[PDB]
């Protein structure tokens, strides 16, 4: 029955070793709703598929510990996890019960996590300047739409410098925030054509005569939750004069609120048609807000706090923006909420442009799993970092194999199963790049292998996985074009890929019913 | 324990808001808002008596019942 | 390419020898039971004999051939 539980997962496993690596393919799944979404990471495809496995489902809420809490490793903990169980097949067959398998993982837990802080050579001074943050951002965006990677590292380096405010020597207050960052997307255009604008776009028509504000700063901003109508009584007043009466007491309303200064006015509900005609006479943009969630965050940037009520322009619930203009994105015009100095906003919008909708979706998604490592990058290991694109995986390989003959007992048989376990991880890279599998894998071991007349290592330990496809032959140092796997993502990931393949062997009976 | 609730509240007998603009609402809507400010300068003035200046003291509100949004400025400048 | 082995035998091996020993079981002692073995000759003889039963009657399970030697 144990061989059983791992053949359900096999067949979700092949789709994950396609997925992880930048030569990793997409796969289509249309969704209940009539609608065609693709997309690199899993954890996202995982909730679209149905799966009737309970064993499989284990993986899947393993898989959210590296999207909520992580912003990458989505792709490498599937694969980690479904190897360990082939890997384990060995160790059933000769009669091995499953509790010095899991007793064999948890001892070589201990091993990799310890030599993980020896693995780290350089550390990342945090000093989030323009150049320095391309270094951690590039690998994340990576692995997703190979060859764009070097323009949307601008576009994320900009907006992350911006959410993040000024200090320094402060490390208990937390800066960053995820949802802060909106991303929009607009069908026509090129990729060329992005930039990073500070605040949040609005796609909406203006929906009255005023296209725009002035160049004024500190232009005052009202948001009603109320939808704009006559003003009625908080007590009773059921409506059962009525079209007069409506034209004085709504002109009445959006003097008051002129006379003021008000040049904005957000109402987040529906507005009337006969709300159109004044605010055009009195110079008062018209903004509509349907989306609730959009006006929380509003609120950070202009200041402005959402009324109940109507009718009641309090200055304390104003905001201040210095300029409101309207400009043509991707072929159509919508008015933009913008600043420049003043009012320093932790809210930052990333446009984007393209001919084909579903590439700008991946895009999308690939910058929320961007922006989602800056979150990684405070005290708990931030700054420390180890090279990726195969070459960790390899490297460990010899020192786990050093600690199996060293540890005496039945555990030899687990650490050798462990370190093998780690060679899926290039096997990939050589599959997905079209390399051939008797190529790759050798020539990683007498790289990482070699005989050095001295105690200090030397020649170079960052050889990865090439994608090849160019220059000559081998691989090169990924160094060259800075790389990396952070330290948060890889350590994390291990103790993840353990508890996932540990759950599954530990279970021996499963009970179900007909569905 | 505070078992007050804190809450926006109503004349204890029934009536209504009768008014033309949206400036006297505001000062019929205060006067039921008395009786909820009333109880507060009685409770700040408990913390100020009892180890108000003294150091490595706190006063804190349990208050089972709900909070209005008025009384969270309040209680954050004590 | 698996490691795992059955049994498949001794279980009916054994099987196959309760069988057997339940029909010579009867047949021990002075206070047992006397069988009837007639095969394709029409003549009836009765005997106790543990040997003269297993020559008289043919079987084709493989546990009774070395019973039988």
Known sequence: ?515 | ILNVSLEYEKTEVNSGFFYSSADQRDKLAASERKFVDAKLKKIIDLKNEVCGMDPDKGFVIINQKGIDPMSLDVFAKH | AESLRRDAALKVNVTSAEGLQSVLETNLGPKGTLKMLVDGAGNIKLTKDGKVLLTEMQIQSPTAVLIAR
């Open chain 1, 1 to 515: 029955q144990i061989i059983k539980s791992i053949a359900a997962i096999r067949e979700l496993h092949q789709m994950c070793l396609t997925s992880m690596g930048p030569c990793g393919r997409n796969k289509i799944i249309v969704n209940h709703l009539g609608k065609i979404i693709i997309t690199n990471d899993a954890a996202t495809m995982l909730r679209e598929l149905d799966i009737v496995h309970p064993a499989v489902k284990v993986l899947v809420m393993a898989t959210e510990q590296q999207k909520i809490d992580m912003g990458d490793g989505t792709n490498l903990v599937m694969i980690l996890a479904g190897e360990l169980l082939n890997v384990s097949e060995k160790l059933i067959s000769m009669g091995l019960s499953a509790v010095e398998i899991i007793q064999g993982y948890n001892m070589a837990r201990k091993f990799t996590l310890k030599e993980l802080d020896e693995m780290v050579v350089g550390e990342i001074t945090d000093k989030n300047d323009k150049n320095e943050l391309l270094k951690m951002i590039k690998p994340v965006i990576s692995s997703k739409k190979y060859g764009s990677e070097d323009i949307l590292s601008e576009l994320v380096s900009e907006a992350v410098s911006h959410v993040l405010p000024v200090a320094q020597q402060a490390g208990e207050i937390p800066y960053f925030n995820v949802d802060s960052i909106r991303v929009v997307k607009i069908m026509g255009g090129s990729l060329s054509n992005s930039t990073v604008i500070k605040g949040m776009v609005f796609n909406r028509e203006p929906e009255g005569h005023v296209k725009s504000l002035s160049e004024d700063k500190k232009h005052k901003v009202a948001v009603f939750t109320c939808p704009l109508d006559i003003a009625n009584t908080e007590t009773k007043g059921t409506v059962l004069d009525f079209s007069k009466g409506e034209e004085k007491q709504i002109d009445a309303m959006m003097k008051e609120i002129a006379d003021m200064g008000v040049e904005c006015i957000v109402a987040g509900a529906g507005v009337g048609e006969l709300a159109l005609h004044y605010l055009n006479r009195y110079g008062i943009l018209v903004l509509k807000v349907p989306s609730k969630f959009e006006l929380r965050r509003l609120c950070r940037v202009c200041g402005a706090t959402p009324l109940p009520r109507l009718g009641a322009p309090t200055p304390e619930e104003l905001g201040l923006v210095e300029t409101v203009k309207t400009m043509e994105i991707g072929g159509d015009r919508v008015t933009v909420f913008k600043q420049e100095q003043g009012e320093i906003s932790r809210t930052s919008t990333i446009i984007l442009r393209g001919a084909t909708q579903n590439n700008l979706d991946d895009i999308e998604r690939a910058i929320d799993d961007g922006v989602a490592a800056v979150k990684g990058l405070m005290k708990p290991s931030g700054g420390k970092l180890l090279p990726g694109a195969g070459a960790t995986e390899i490297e460990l390989i010899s020192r786990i194999t050093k600690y199996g003959e060293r540890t005496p007992g039945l555990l030899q048989l687990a650490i050798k199963q462990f370190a093998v376990a780690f060679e899926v991880v290039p096997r990939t890279l050589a599959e997905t790049a079209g390399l051939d599998v008797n190529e790759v894998l050798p020539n990683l071991y007498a790289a990482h292998n070699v005989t050095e007349p001295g105690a200090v290592k030397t020649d170079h330990l960052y050889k990865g996985v090439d994608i090849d496809g160019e220059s000559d032959e081998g691989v090169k140092d990924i160094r060259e074009e800075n790389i990396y796997d952070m330290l948060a993502t890889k350590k994390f990931a291990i103790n993840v890929a353990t508890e996932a393949a540990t759950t599954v062997l530990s279970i021996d009976q499963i009970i179900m019913a007909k569905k």
